[PDB]
Amino acid sequence: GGLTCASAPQGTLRILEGPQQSLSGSPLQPIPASPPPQIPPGLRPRFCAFG
Amino acid sequence: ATPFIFSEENSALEYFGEMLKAAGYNFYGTERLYSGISGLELEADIFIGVVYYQRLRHMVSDK
């Protein structure tokens, strides 16, 4: 029950949970481009010149 | 009329100009106006359209 002292420890192993692999996909997923505005189909002159 | 949706290769004046060319009117928004103080045709064509005006409370002073 004396509990004598011991020598100096050489190395200290650190145990830790691993990096989060297979979380990010190898291609990227962007928000798609909002489309450029279209001229709508079915546009015709509705105004006739009077008389 | 949301901002940043018109680029420089698809402009905001090559879109509504073609909308007006489809509706018969001028590509550049300029309609031929006559006069009413005289009666004859103004020689330089006049930009006309529809613009949403408002009305401020900052009224005439009434003082």
DSSP string, B12-41: SSSSHHHHHHHTTS-TTSEE----SSS-S-
The C-alpha atoms of residue A22 and residue B13 are separated, in whole angstroms, by 48
Rounded to a whole number of angstroms, the distance from the CA of A38 to the nearest CA of chain B is: 8
> Residues B29, B49: contact at Cβ < 8 Å?
yes
The C-alpha atoms of residue A46 and residue A44 are separated, in whole angstroms, by 6
Task: Provide φ and ψ at B54, rounded to 5°.
Answer: -130, -165
- CB contacts, 8 Å: B19 with chain A: 39, 43
Rounded to a whole number of angstroms, the distance from the CA of B63 to the nearest CA of chain A is: 48
Q: Which long-range contacts (CB under 8 A, 24 or more apart) does A37-42 make?
A: A37/B5, A37/B6, A37/B10, A37/B15, A39/B15, A39/B18, A39/B19, A39/B22
Q: State the number of CA atoms in the 13 A half-sphere of A14 facing the CB.
A: 3
The C-alpha atoms of residue B22 and residue A45 are separated, in whole angstroms, by 6
Check CB contact of B23 with chain A, cutoff 8 Å: yes
**A13-50 burial code (b ≥16 CB/10 A, e <16):** eeeeeeeeeeeeeeeeeeeeeeeeeeeeeeeeeeeeee
Looking at A1-51, list the stretches that DSSP marks H as alpha helix, in order from N- to C-terminal side.
none
Q: First-to-last CA distance in chain A?
A: 121
Check CB contact of B5 with chain A, cutoff 8 Å: yes
Angle at B19 between CA B15 and CA B23, to 5 degrees: 165
In Å, how far from its chain's centre is CA B17?
Answer: 11
